[PDB]
Write a protein that binds this ligand. Structure first.
Ligand code: HEM
Length: 214
């Protein structure tokens, strides 16, 4: 379609379903997730968002990203820091795993944010809008499956405090995406990059599943 947001959604339908079909994610949906599994996914998210938000700040004033810059509404790094301090303890920075699959994702994020800025929107879109609109169902499952204490912490990642209405913010963000000016060629690369984002998540899930079944 003409609208980039609508174009992205349609192009990534296949891969998104592929992501839902991933073994690790299948179990997740079937309410089957363990503490070790959830810890691994949280650590992954921490690394992914550290890299993504590092690159967003580097290109926040660029006309190729500025229109979709919503730092207060979307930042997740601080939330994950809080969360990992719960899951891995006070020395979490020293013990959280940083696997090859995580490194491949982080590496693509830095390359994009450093040499192909116009493609950063593909990752911001995939991560932010994906986690926001899907957070509810993912958290619901997690908390009833993890049976954690009334600690009052460990899942801050699933709540975007600076966003009163998810649906409302989503349409705003989409509107801003469709306001972005880019050559047909770039537009194609952004759509491709979005598919690449899903592939990076899929290989991540495959790796985490592998680490948990020994
Ligand atoms: C537990 C597996 C998953 C399930 C069952 C799932 C579920 C959801 C739900 C409920 C929505 C909102 C409705 C919609 O699709 O429009 C959503 C949207 C989306 N998801 Fe997922 N998702 C999963 C994994 C992922 C992963 C791994 C990514 C990739 C980083 C992702 C990226 C997206 C994106 C970008 C959207 C927004 C699409 C749009 O409305 O334009 N999802 N997801």
């Amino acid at each position: 379609p003409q609208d980039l947001s609508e174009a992205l959604k349609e192009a990534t339908k296949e891969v998104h379903t592929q992501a839902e079909n991933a073994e690790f994610m299948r179990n997740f949906q079937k309410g089957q997730v363990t503490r070790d599994g959830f810890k691994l996914v949280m650590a992954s998210l921490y690394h992914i968002y550290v890299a993504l938000e590092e690159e967003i700040e580097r290109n926040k004033e660029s006309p190729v990203f500025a229109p979709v810059y919503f730092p207060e509404e979307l930042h997740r790094k601080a939330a994950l820091e809080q969360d990992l301090a719960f899951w891995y303890g006070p020395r979490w920075q020293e013990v959280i795993p940083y696997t090859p699959a995580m490194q491949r994702y982080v590496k693509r994020l830095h390359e994009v944010g450093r040499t192909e800025p116009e493609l950063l929107v593909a990752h911001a879109y995939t991560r932010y809008l994906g986690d926001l609109s899907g957070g509810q169902v993912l958290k619901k499952i997690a908390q009833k499956a993890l049976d954690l204490p009334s600690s009052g912490e460990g899942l801050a990642f699933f709540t975007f405090p600076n966003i009163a209405s998810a649906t409302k913010f989503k349409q705003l963000y989409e509107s801003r995406m469709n306001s972005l000016e880019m050559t047909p060629a770039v537009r194609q690369r952004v759509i491709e990059e979005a598919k690449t984002a899903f592939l990076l998540n899929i290989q991540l899930f495959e790796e985490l599943q592998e680490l948990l079944t020994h």
